[PDB]
RNA sequence: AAACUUUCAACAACGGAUCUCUUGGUUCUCGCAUCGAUGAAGAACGCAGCGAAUUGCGAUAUGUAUUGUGAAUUGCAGAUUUUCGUGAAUCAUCAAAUCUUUGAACGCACAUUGCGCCCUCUGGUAUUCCAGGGGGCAUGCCUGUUUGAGCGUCAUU
């Protein structure tokens, strides 16, 4: 007894212990290898003659 | 008389009838029961040495694995010797995988390849910033879970 004197007439939802995930098995099972590798990002270089201008003269492959 | 018009012939056009064909349909019978949040159906964009479509598949992209078959594929090119072999093939089979972006579509959005937050790791002086790799975060309901709320309500110091 001697109850909780409150000030806010507004009764908000009382902050509580939001527990985190501790799942009994991995959903994915095997972590997937990198979607987008080094080699998989950059495919072919270019041979359009006006790129080979830009390579040699501008220093941009 | 010629030209012309007409009729009719052979040959030639035009045109695609007829005939004959037929990997399509068609109805009838029989057998079976098997989609999907373990992401279905559908879509989008891709992917072939040379593909536009089709067919197949998903950045492991006309496939990988497995098994069988036992030498193809074939338009060209090309391999490779694997041809008394754990092994050819646009083969069959198919139980292992991959399965972009989507889509019931599920972080929140969605005429946008937009905008977040969390966990973890690696870069950059980094718990907080950025970036990269991974794994997440939908709603309802259910069973439990812990955390709580109500002088709803009981019993105690």
UniProtKB/Swiss-Prot annotation:
Transmembrane segments: none annotated. It comes from the Eukaryota. Belongs to the universal ribosomal protein uL23 family. This is Large ribosomal subunit protein uL23. It comes from Kluyveromyces lactis (strain ATCC 8585 / CBS 2359 / DSM 70799 / NBRC 1267 / NRRL Y-1140 / WM37) (Yeast). The gene is RPL25. The chain holds residues 22 to 82 of 142 of the full protein.
């Amino acid at each position: 007894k001697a109850l909780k004197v409150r000030t806010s007439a507004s009764f908000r939802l009382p902050k509580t212990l939001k527990l985190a995930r501790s799942p009994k098995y991995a959903t994915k099972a095997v972590p997937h290898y990198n979607r987008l590798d080094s080699y998989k990002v950059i495919e072919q270089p270019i041979t359009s003659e006006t790129a080979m201008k830009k390579v040699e003269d501008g220093n941009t492959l």
